[PDB]
């Protein structure tokens, strides 16, 4: 049960939550801040 809950928490980093990519470093390489923040707010909301 502990291992399943950790594996589930780690695996949830791969999810988009509606961002254009689930990788934070993609958004920061691709997008300038005024448009990047809209994508990162979706990732923060899902990861939180």
């Amino acid at each position: 049960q502990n291992a399943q809950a950790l594996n589930t928490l780690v695996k949830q980093l791969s999810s988009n939550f509606g961002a254009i990519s689930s990788v934070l470093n993609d958004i920061l390489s691709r997008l300038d801040p005024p448009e990047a923040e809209v994508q990162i707010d979706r990732l923060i909301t899902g990861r939180l």
Binding site: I20, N25, L28, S29, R30, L31, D32, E35
Partner: protein, 214 residues
């Protein structure tokens, strides 16, 4: 542990990309049946395009034009065609109207740039050649029409457009920015960048048996 230095690892290729052969073509295609060059195995300066006074717009989606020189793509697809100056509004993802459906439907999730400019100097004469009417479909009784361009035409003037669509796949990259490679560093915490895949970590050489395509 904060990273000690940055490491940049782009492919060992230096030939400049053929954008000039798109942007200065003798004729841009009739929009009902647009044309599409593929760029691959070259170095892509985007600042030479974005800095140019020649462009009435340079609008990008899924990427910011300021960032394009950091990216490293597997292919780049450049569409080329002519439209009236009002219709540049319809060349964007999620639009509605005659250009947005009947000849050049963009994907709803497009990552790319639309680069458009007035060409009333060179496409007007009138000239009646440029013929008009799913995502990246060519829409070859049936509807056929063509634009009437005279230099006296602003919304009815000819605009030339290039649309760059970017391939962010995980394959070996081939269309990469001017950002020059560093040496590799091992057993040290570094701000690494392989083909635009940025991260931070201790790089160390591995015993893992990657198959030749991986």
């Amino acid at each position: 542990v904060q990273p000690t230095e940055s490491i940049v690892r782009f492919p060992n290729i230096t030939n400049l990309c053929p954008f000039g052969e798109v942007f200065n073509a003798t004729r841009f295609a009739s929009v009902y049946a647009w044309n599409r060059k593929r760029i691959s195995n070259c170095v892509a300066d985007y600042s030479v395009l974005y800095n140019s006074a020649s462009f009435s717009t340079f609008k990008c989606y899924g990427v910011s034009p300021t960032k394009l020189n950091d990216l490293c793509f597997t292919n780049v697809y450049a569409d080329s065609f002519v439209i009236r100056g009002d219709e540049v509004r319809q060349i964007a993802p999620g639009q509605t109207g005659k250009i947005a459906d009947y000849n050049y439907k963009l994907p709803d999730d497009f990552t790319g740039c639309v680069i458009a400019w007035n060409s009333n100097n060179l496409d007007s004469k009138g000239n009646y050649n440029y013929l008009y009417r799913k995502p990246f479909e060519r829409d070859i009784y049936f509807p056929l029409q063509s634009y009437g361009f005279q230099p006296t035409n602003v919304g009815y003037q000819p605009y030339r457009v290039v649309v760059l669509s970017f391939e962010l796949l995980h394959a070996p990259a081939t269309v990469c920015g001017p950002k020059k490679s560093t040496n590799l560093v091992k057993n040290k915490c570094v701000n690494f960048n392989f083909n635009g895949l940025t991260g931070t970590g201790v790089l160390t050489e591995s015993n893992k048996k990657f198959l030749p395509f991986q």
